[PDB]
Amino acid sequence: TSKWFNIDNKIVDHRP
Amino acid sequence: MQVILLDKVANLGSLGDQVNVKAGYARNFLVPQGKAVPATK
Amino acid sequence: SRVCQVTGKRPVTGNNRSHALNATKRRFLPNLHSHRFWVESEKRFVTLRVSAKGMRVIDKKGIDTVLAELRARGEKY
Amino acid sequence: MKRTFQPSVLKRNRSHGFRARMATKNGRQVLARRRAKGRARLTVSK
RNA sequence: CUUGACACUGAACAUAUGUUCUAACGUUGACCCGUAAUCCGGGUUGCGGACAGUGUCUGGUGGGUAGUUUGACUGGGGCGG
RNA sequence: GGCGAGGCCGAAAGGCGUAGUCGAUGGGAAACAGGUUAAUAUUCCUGUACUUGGUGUUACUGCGAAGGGGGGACGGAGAAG
RNA sequence: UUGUAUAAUGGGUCAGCGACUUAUAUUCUGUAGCAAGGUUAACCGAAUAGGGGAGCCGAAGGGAAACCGAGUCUUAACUGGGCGUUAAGUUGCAGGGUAUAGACCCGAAACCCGGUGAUCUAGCCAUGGGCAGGUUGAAGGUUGGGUAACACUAACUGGAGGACCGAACCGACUAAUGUUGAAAAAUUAGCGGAUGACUUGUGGCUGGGGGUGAAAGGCCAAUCAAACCGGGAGAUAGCUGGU
RNA sequence: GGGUGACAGCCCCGUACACAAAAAUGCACAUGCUGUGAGCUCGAUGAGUAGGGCGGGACACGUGGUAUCCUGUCUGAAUAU
RNA sequence: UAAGGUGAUAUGAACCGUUAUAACCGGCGAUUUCCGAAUGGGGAAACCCAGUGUGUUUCGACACACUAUCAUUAACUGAAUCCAUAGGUUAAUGAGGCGAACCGGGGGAACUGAAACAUCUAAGUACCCCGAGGAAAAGAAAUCAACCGAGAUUCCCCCAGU
Ligand SMILES: N[C@@H](Cc1c[nH]c2ccccc12)C(=O)O
Ligand SMILES: [Mg+2]
Ligand SMILES: [Mg+2]
Ligand SMILES: [Mg+2]
Ligand SMILES: [Mg+2]
Ligand SMILES: [Mg+2]
Ligand SMILES: [Mg+2]
Ligand SMILES: [Mg+2]
Ligand SMILES: [Mg+2]
Ligand SMILES: [Mg+2]
Ligand SMILES: [Mg+2]
Ligand SMILES: [Mg+2]
Ligand SMILES: [Mg+2]
Ligand SMILES: [Mg+2]
Ligand SMILES: [Mg+2]
Ligand SMILES: [Mg+2]
Ligand SMILES: [Mg+2]
Ligand SMILES: [Mg+2]
Ligand SMILES: [Mg+2]
Ligand SMILES: [Mg+2]
Ligand SMILES: [Mg+2]
Ligand SMILES: [Mg+2]
Ligand SMILES: [Mg+2]
Ligand SMILES: [Mg+2]
Ligand SMILES: [Mg+2]
Ligand SMILES: [Mg+2]
Ligand SMILES: [Mg+2]
Ligand SMILES: [Mg+2]
Ligand SMILES: [Mg+2]
Ligand SMILES: [Mg+2]
Ligand SMILES: [Mg+2]
Ligand SMILES: [Mg+2]
Ligand SMILES: [Mg+2]
Ligand SMILES: [Mg+2]
Ligand SMILES: [Mg+2]
Ligand SMILES: [Mg+2]
Ligand SMILES: [Mg+2]
Ligand SMILES: [Mg+2]
Ligand SMILES: [Mg+2]
Ligand SMILES: [Mg+2]
Ligand SMILES: [Mg+2]
Ligand SMILES: [Mg+2]
Ligand SMILES: [Mg+2]
Ligand SMILES: [Mg+2]
Ligand SMILES: [Mg+2]
Ligand SMILES: [Mg+2]
């Protein structure tokens, strides 16, 4: 499936 | 509705006589209680 | 079912057409009523689910004739 | 962790068994589809 | 959901209205029968009664629900123009 | 809770439901100790028991239900013998 | 792409597969036949022959039309003017383009239709089980004082509570570890409830614009601002990649 | 057409052709039984129907100047002059 | 029809047959457990439990047959209610379920196209349901035509992308 650090929100939305 | 009275109902006509009555009055009262036969001939 | 016992009228489908012609499905239902007809041949009251057009057919033709027709078509009453 | 399959033969057979398939009208359609495919096993009974 | 017209839906009387009646119709009142049965059907009676309810047509209301619209330019977009 | 003869209802398929008939997680008769096999035993063996039903003799005798009654038949907590 | 060594995209490499096609109609070109003509379709024929000329295109145009016709229309009529006469077509085969079909290939999020799902979870219904141990001491009661009778009070008794401390059991507040883990949500050390609006076993019921929800758009089989499965379906894609 | 130790007209199975059915059955005839009635004369000519009002649908025809067909509701003839 | 044969992986053992009961092929028959429309009741398919009637027993029991529902017809019986009806019992006949497509009918979308979208299209398509057949449906003018005529229905090519 998918990696947890890609599902996470604090590190994915790192540069809004 | 044209109906032939077979009795005397004093309200509308005499015995053996053709007269115009309302359809429900012929259907529900007269024909189920005698007193009238439709003009089938 | 909403089927007339005498004339066989059943619901039919059509459309609601508005002022802007928007078509949506709808049903036309017959004017069914359960009426007790006095049959003289049997000295009996027979209850029929019949429309008002069917009631007019009853009054024209005679209850005995349409009871014979119903018995020929096989449905109970 | 409690997972989604907690098996029970009685509930299995009342849900997906042959008599429940024949009881509902669309279950007979399911059996028709599986027979037309040619499955070795139609329902969960065997 | 609601309003009216026509149908199922009838009869007298008084000035469309009002009063009165039973036979359509309703009864999720009582009793009897099918029947070993709080469904259903038939019968008698009682209470309503041409009212209610339903069908076709019809005006109102109707984010309860549905289908969609909500422009472009633009020293990024919106606001302004 | 399910299915459901007739039945009531619904464009068709089907929805509900009476009589019934299924459905335990509950109610309903009766076995214990010792020993044994590589692997079974309240099941086999030894010892001692118990239950229900059919048949046949004996004695007395009003038996019989789909019906009436009793019973089965029921909570929480606590305290002590 | 204005522009890539670009630190912009794609590719670990090999081998096999992978993207302008097909049918019908129409216009243009080349070529072949016949030529003011060309050619048949369905069908008959055992017949790739032959029959079949039903039709279609062309040899005549102008006008909205009647109508006129190498003319016609406009206008009451043109010295006029517009459109025409002043240039050969047609039927195959091959090709370019177009049109309808998926129309060069792969790719959505979504919409609709019919079913399979409450063995996880939400709620409810039926019927069974569980909660070591230790505290606190409400109402009520008995005796005594007290009152005209109550009221009030002391001791003994009693055993209330969505009561208290704490295992089972239920949960999940903090920290570290783990994060290609022992584990697609746990371990360790502490933490909250623990006779109740408690928790649990077996079985049943509620279905997708629907259920259930002490309400977080939460949960409905590791999926939920509308489940999963098959179908309309090769949806559509003025967008990206490849050719 | 296939096979045979490599490519077969003449090695094998086959093919063209000519035959074959005790039993069951299809078809086209002919023929019994059962059921059915033809020929001639006179008479009759499908009524809640056609049509109409309202709402829809089908016709290539989207209510348009809209013919025609079907009908959910309400009515309703002529009938061979 | 035959000198070979007892199906295959798959040998082996024991055999059968060689001029016609070996084996192989075809027609007709026989047997055909249990589930399944499932049909005696029930059921968690391939299982549990019977009622009735014959017949046999070694007295323990055993074998066979029938018993679903609905429709039509007939007989017998029969309520509230006096005749009758409703109902009940039996007998006979028929149906049910499965199947690729085609066919008639009852319901009936949306994505999509319109370069948005709502009338419109997609489309009476997909899909659901009912029924029938070897085909179905339609069919013998209350039809067209045009002052002349044709002569039921169905299907193909034109008319005409008019
Ligand atoms: N990383 C943690 C938490 C986690 C699980 N799944 C996730 C998805 C998204 C973000 C975090 C997580 C773990 O592996 O257990
Ligand atoms: Mg109520
Ligand atoms: Mg909205
Ligand atoms: Mg939008
Ligand atoms: Mg802009
Ligand atoms: Mg700006
Ligand atoms: Mg029950
Ligand atoms: Mg029934
Ligand atoms: Mg039910
Ligand atoms: Mg029982
Ligand atoms: Mg039990
Ligand atoms: Mg052991
Ligand atoms: Mg460039
Ligand atoms: Mg750039
Ligand atoms: Mg450079
Ligand atoms: Mg580099
Ligand atoms: Mg690069
Ligand atoms: Mg890119
Ligand atoms: Mg890369
Ligand atoms: Mg011309
Ligand atoms: Mg949408
Ligand atoms: Mg559950
Ligand atoms: Mg507490
Ligand atoms: Mg929780
Ligand atoms: Mg938390
Ligand atoms: Mg812990
Ligand atoms: Mg506490
Ligand atoms: Mg505690
Ligand atoms: Mg929110
Ligand atoms: Mg989940
Ligand atoms: Mg949605
Ligand atoms: Mg499509
Ligand atoms: Mg696609
Ligand atoms: Mg070789
Ligand atoms: Mg006629
Ligand atoms: Mg009409
Ligand atoms: Mg008209
Ligand atoms: Mg059964
Ligand atoms: Mg059985
Ligand atoms: Mg039983
Ligand atoms: Mg059949
Ligand atoms: Mg849309
Ligand atoms: Mg569009
Ligand atoms: Mg578009
Ligand atoms: Mg026919
Ligand atoms: Mg003529």
Coordinates of N, CA and C (backbone and C1' of nucleotides) in Angstrom, one line a residue, chain I residues 6-54:
Chain I
rU6 P -9.3 -53.7 -23.9 O5' -9.7 -54.3 -22.5 C5' -11.1 -54.4 -22.1 C4' -11.3 -55.0 -20.7 C3' -10.4 -54.3 -19.6 O3' -11.0 -53.1 -19.2 C1' -10.4 -56.7 -19.4
rG7 P -10.0 -52.1 -18.5 O5' -10.3 -50.7 -19.3 C5' -10.3 -50.6 -20.7 C4' -10.5 -49.2 -21.2 C3' -9.3 -48.3 -20.8 O3' -8.2 -48.4 -21.7 C1' -11.3 -47.2 -20.2
rA8 P -6.7 -48.3 -21.1 O5' -6.6 -46.8 -20.6 C5' -6.4 -45.7 -21.5 C4' -6.0 -44.5 -20.9 C3' -4.8 -44.6 -19.9 O3' -3.5 -44.5 -20.6 C1' -6.5 -43.4 -18.8
rU9 P -2.2 -45.2 -20.0 O5' -1.8 -44.2 -18.9 C5' -1.3 -42.9 -19.2 C4' -1.1 -42.1 -18.0 C3' -0.1 -42.6 -17.0 O3' 1.3 -42.3 -17.3 C1' -2.0 -41.9 -15.8
rA10 P 2.4 -43.4 -17.1 O5' 1.7 -44.8 -17.4 C5' 2.5 -46.0 -17.7 C4' 1.7 -47.3 -17.3 C3' 0.3 -47.4 -17.9 O3' 0.1 -48.8 -18.2 C1' 0.2 -47.4 -15.6
rU11 P 0.5 -49.5 -19.6 O5' 2.0 -50.1 -19.3 C5' 2.1 -51.5 -18.8 C4' 3.1 -51.6 -17.7 C3' 3.2 -52.9 -17.1 O3' 3.9 -53.9 -17.8 C1' 3.1 -51.3 -15.4
rG12 P 3.3 -55.4 -18.0 O5' 3.0 -55.9 -16.6 C5' 4.1 -56.4 -15.7 C4' 3.6 -56.6 -14.3 C3' 2.6 -57.8 -14.1 O3' 3.2 -59.1 -14.1 C1' 1.8 -55.9 -12.9
rA13 P 2.4 -60.3 -14.6 O5' 1.4 -60.7 -13.5 C5' 1.8 -61.1 -12.2 C4' 0.6 -61.2 -11.2 C3' -0.5 -62.2 -11.7 O3' -0.2 -63.5 -11.3 C1' -1.4 -60.1 -11.1
rA14 P -0.7 -64.7 -12.2 O5' -2.3 -64.7 -12.2 C5' -2.9 -65.0 -11.0 C4' -4.4 -64.8 -11.1 C3' -5.1 -65.5 -12.3 O3' -5.4 -66.9 -11.9 C1' -5.7 -63.3 -12.4
rC15 P -5.5 -68.0 -13.1 O5' -6.8 -67.7 -13.8 C5' -6.8 -67.5 -15.2 C4' -7.9 -66.4 -15.6 C3' -8.6 -66.6 -16.9 O3' -9.6 -67.5 -16.9 C1' -7.9 -64.4 -16.7
rC16 P -9.9 -68.6 -18.1 O5' -10.8 -67.7 -19.1 C5' -12.0 -67.1 -18.7 C4' -12.5 -66.1 -19.7 C3' -12.5 -66.6 -21.1 O3' -13.7 -67.4 -21.4 C1' -11.6 -64.4 -21.1
rG17 P -13.6 -68.5 -22.5 O5' -13.2 -67.8 -23.9 C5' -14.3 -67.1 -24.6 C4' -13.7 -66.4 -25.8 C3' -13.0 -67.2 -26.9 O3' -13.9 -67.9 -27.7 C1' -11.7 -65.3 -26.4
rU18 P -13.5 -69.3 -28.4 O5' -12.5 -68.9 -29.6 C5' -13.1 -68.1 -30.6 C4' -12.0 -67.7 -31.6 C3' -11.3 -68.8 -32.4 O3' -12.1 -69.2 -33.5 C1' -9.7 -67.2 -31.6
rU19 P -12.3 -70.8 -33.7 O5' -13.7 -70.9 -34.4 C5' -14.9 -70.5 -33.7 C4' -16.0 -70.0 -34.6 C3' -16.4 -70.8 -35.8 O3' -17.8 -70.6 -36.0 C1' -15.6 -68.8 -36.6
rA20 P -18.8 -71.8 -35.6 O5' -19.6 -71.2 -34.3 C5' -20.2 -69.9 -34.4 C4' -20.0 -69.2 -33.1 C3' -21.0 -68.0 -32.8 O3' -21.3 -67.9 -31.5 C1' -18.7 -67.3 -32.8
rU21 P -22.7 -67.3 -31.0 O5' -22.8 -67.6 -29.5 C5' -21.7 -67.4 -28.6 C4' -21.7 -66.0 -28.0 C3' -20.5 -65.7 -27.1 O3' -20.2 -64.4 -27.1 C1' -22.5 -65.6 -25.9
rA22 P -18.8 -63.9 -27.8 O5' -18.1 -63.0 -26.7 C5' -17.9 -63.4 -25.4 C4' -16.5 -63.0 -24.8 C3' -16.3 -61.5 -24.7 O3' -16.8 -61.0 -23.5 C1' -14.4 -62.5 -25.8
rA23 P -17.6 -59.6 -23.5 O5' -16.7 -58.6 -24.2 C5' -15.6 -58.0 -23.5 C4' -14.6 -57.3 -24.3 C3' -15.2 -56.0 -25.0 O3' -15.2 -54.9 -24.2 C1' -14.0 -57.4 -26.6
rC24 P -16.3 -53.8 -24.4 O5' -16.1 -53.2 -25.9 C5' -15.1 -52.3 -26.1 C4' -15.1 -51.9 -27.6 C3' -16.4 -51.2 -28.1 O3' -16.4 -49.9 -27.7 C1' -15.7 -52.9 -29.6
rC25 P -17.8 -49.2 -27.5 O5' -18.6 -49.1 -28.9 C5' -18.1 -48.3 -29.9 C4' -18.9 -48.5 -31.2 C3' -20.4 -48.3 -31.0 O3' -20.8 -46.9 -31.0 C1' -20.0 -50.2 -32.2
rG26 P -22.1 -46.5 -30.0 O5' -23.3 -47.0 -30.8 C5' -23.8 -46.3 -32.0 C4' -24.9 -47.0 -32.7 C3' -26.2 -47.2 -31.9 O3' -27.0 -46.0 -31.8 C1' -25.7 -49.2 -33.0
rG27 P -27.9 -45.8 -30.6 O5' -29.2 -46.7 -30.9 C5' -30.0 -46.4 -32.0 C4' -31.1 -47.5 -32.2 C3' -32.0 -47.7 -31.0 O3' -33.0 -46.7 -30.7 C1' -31.4 -49.8 -32.0
rC28 P -33.3 -46.3 -29.2 O5' -34.1 -47.5 -28.7 C5' -35.3 -48.0 -29.3 C4' -35.7 -49.4 -28.9 C3' -36.1 -49.5 -27.4 O3' -37.4 -49.1 -27.1 C1' -34.6 -51.3 -28.1
rG29 P -37.8 -48.3 -25.8 O5' -38.0 -49.5 -24.7 C5' -37.3 -49.5 -23.5 C4' -37.1 -51.0 -23.1 C3' -36.8 -51.1 -21.6 O3' -37.9 -51.0 -20.7 C1' -35.4 -52.5 -22.9
rA30 P -37.7 -50.2 -19.4 O5' -36.8 -51.1 -18.5 C5' -37.3 -52.4 -18.1 C4' -36.2 -53.1 -17.3 C3' -35.6 -52.3 -16.1 O3' -36.5 -52.4 -15.0 C1' -33.9 -53.3 -17.3
rU31 P -36.7 -51.0 -14.1 O5' -35.3 -51.0 -13.2 C5' -35.0 -52.1 -12.4 C4' -33.6 -51.9 -11.9 C3' -33.2 -50.6 -11.2 O3' -33.6 -50.6 -9.9 C1' -31.5 -51.2 -12.8
rU32 P -34.4 -49.3 -9.3 O5' -33.4 -48.1 -9.6 C5' -32.2 -47.9 -9.0 C4' -31.3 -47.0 -9.6 C3' -31.7 -45.5 -9.6 O3' -31.3 -44.9 -8.4 C1' -31.0 -46.1 -11.8
rU33 P -32.4 -44.1 -7.5 O5' -31.9 -44.2 -6.0 C5' -31.7 -45.5 -5.4 C4' -30.8 -45.4 -4.2 C3' -30.8 -44.1 -3.5 O3' -31.8 -44.0 -2.5 C1' -28.5 -44.7 -4.0
rC34 P -32.9 -42.8 -2.6 O5' -32.1 -41.6 -2.0 C5' -31.6 -41.6 -0.7 C4' -30.6 -40.4 -0.6 C3' -31.1 -39.1 -1.1 O3' -32.0 -38.4 -0.2 C1' -28.9 -39.4 -1.8
rC35 P -33.1 -37.4 -0.7 O5' -32.3 -36.1 -1.1 C5' -31.6 -35.3 -0.1 C4' -30.7 -34.3 -0.7 C3' -31.4 -33.2 -1.5 O3' -32.0 -32.2 -0.8 C1' -29.4 -33.9 -2.6
rG36 P -33.3 -31.5 -1.2 O5' -33.0 -30.9 -2.7 C5' -32.3 -29.7 -2.8 C4' -32.0 -29.4 -4.3 C3' -33.2 -29.2 -5.2 O3' -33.7 -27.9 -5.1 C1' -31.6 -30.7 -6.2
rA37 P -35.0 -27.6 -4.2 O5' -36.1 -27.5 -5.3 C5' -35.9 -27.2 -6.6 C4' -37.2 -26.8 -7.3 C3' -38.4 -27.1 -6.6 O3' -38.7 -26.2 -5.6 C1' -38.6 -27.7 -8.9
rA38 P -39.8 -26.6 -4.4 O5' -39.7 -28.2 -4.3 C5' -38.8 -28.8 -3.4 C4' -39.0 -30.2 -3.3 C3' -38.0 -31.0 -2.4 O3' -38.6 -32.1 -1.8 C1' -37.9 -31.9 -4.5
rU39 P -39.7 -31.9 -0.6 O5' -41.1 -31.8 -1.4 C5' -42.3 -32.2 -0.8 C4' -43.2 -33.0 -1.7 C3' -42.6 -34.2 -2.3 O3' -43.6 -35.2 -2.5 C1' -43.3 -32.8 -4.0
rG40 P -43.5 -36.6 -1.7 O5' -44.0 -36.2 -0.2 C5' -45.3 -35.6 0.0 C4' -45.7 -35.6 1.4 C3' -44.9 -34.6 2.3 O3' -45.4 -33.3 2.3 C1' -45.0 -36.7 3.3
rG41 P -44.4 -32.1 2.7 O5' -44.3 -32.2 4.3 C5' -45.3 -31.7 5.1 C4' -44.8 -31.6 6.5 C3' -43.6 -30.7 6.7 O3' -43.8 -29.3 6.8 C1' -43.2 -32.8 7.8
rG42 P -42.8 -28.4 6.0 O5' -41.4 -28.5 6.9 C5' -41.4 -28.1 8.2 C4' -40.2 -28.6 8.9 C3' -38.8 -28.0 8.5 O3' -38.6 -26.7 9.0 C1' -38.6 -30.3 8.8
rG43 P -37.8 -25.6 8.0 O5' -36.3 -26.2 8.0 C5' -35.5 -26.2 9.1 C4' -34.2 -27.0 8.9 C3' -33.3 -26.4 7.8 O3' -32.5 -25.3 8.2 C1' -33.6 -28.7 7.4
rA44 P -32.4 -24.0 7.3 O5' -30.9 -24.0 6.8 C5' -29.9 -23.8 7.7 C4' -28.5 -24.3 7.2 C3' -28.5 -25.7 6.6 O3' -27.4 -25.8 5.7 C1' -27.2 -25.7 8.6
rA45 P -27.5 -25.4 4.2 O5' -28.2 -26.6 3.5 C5' -27.4 -27.8 3.4 C4' -28.1 -28.9 2.6 C3' -27.4 -30.2 2.4 O3' -27.6 -31.1 3.5 C1' -28.2 -29.4 0.3
rA46 P -26.5 -31.9 4.1 O5' -26.5 -33.3 3.3 C5' -27.7 -34.0 3.0 C4' -27.6 -34.9 1.9 C3' -26.3 -35.7 1.8 O3' -26.5 -36.9 2.5 C1' -26.5 -34.5 -0.2
rC47 P -25.4 -37.5 3.6 O5' -26.0 -37.0 5.0 C5' -27.2 -37.7 5.5 C4' -27.8 -36.8 6.6 C3' -29.0 -37.3 7.3 O3' -28.7 -38.2 8.4 C1' -29.4 -35.1 6.7
rC48 P -29.8 -39.2 8.9 O5' -30.8 -38.4 9.8 C5' -30.4 -37.8 11.0 C4' -31.5 -37.0 11.6 C3' -32.9 -37.7 11.9 O3' -32.9 -38.5 13.0 C1' -33.3 -35.6 10.8
rC49 P -33.8 -39.8 13.1 O5' -35.3 -39.2 13.0 C5' -35.9 -38.6 14.1 C4' -37.3 -38.1 13.7 C3' -38.4 -39.0 13.4 O3' -38.9 -39.7 14.5 C1' -38.4 -37.3 11.8
rA50 P -39.4 -41.2 14.4 O5' -40.0 -41.3 12.9 C5' -41.3 -41.9 12.7 C4' -42.3 -40.8 12.4 C3' -43.7 -41.4 11.9 O3' -44.5 -41.7 13.0 C1' -43.0 -39.7 10.5
rG51 P -45.4 -43.0 12.9 O5' -46.7 -42.5 12.0 C5' -47.5 -41.5 12.5 C4' -48.6 -41.1 11.5 C3' -49.3 -42.3 10.9 O3' -50.4 -42.7 11.7 C1' -48.6 -40.9 9.2
rU52 P -50.8 -44.3 11.8 O5' -51.3 -44.6 10.3 C5' -52.6 -44.1 9.9 C4' -52.8 -44.3 8.4 C3' -52.9 -45.7 7.9 O3' -54.1 -46.3 8.2 C1' -51.5 -44.5 6.5
rG53 P -54.2 -47.9 8.5 O5' -53.9 -48.5 7.0 C5' -54.8 -48.3 6.0 C4' -54.3 -49.1 4.7 C3' -53.9 -50.5 5.0 O3' -55.0 -51.4 5.0 C1' -52.3 -49.4 3.6
rU54 P -54.8 -52.9 5.4 O5' -54.6 -53.6 4.0 C5' -54.0 -54.9 3.9 C4' -53.0 -55.0 2.7 C3' -52.0 -56.1 2.7 O3' -52.6 -57.3 2.4 C1' -50.9 -54.1 2.2

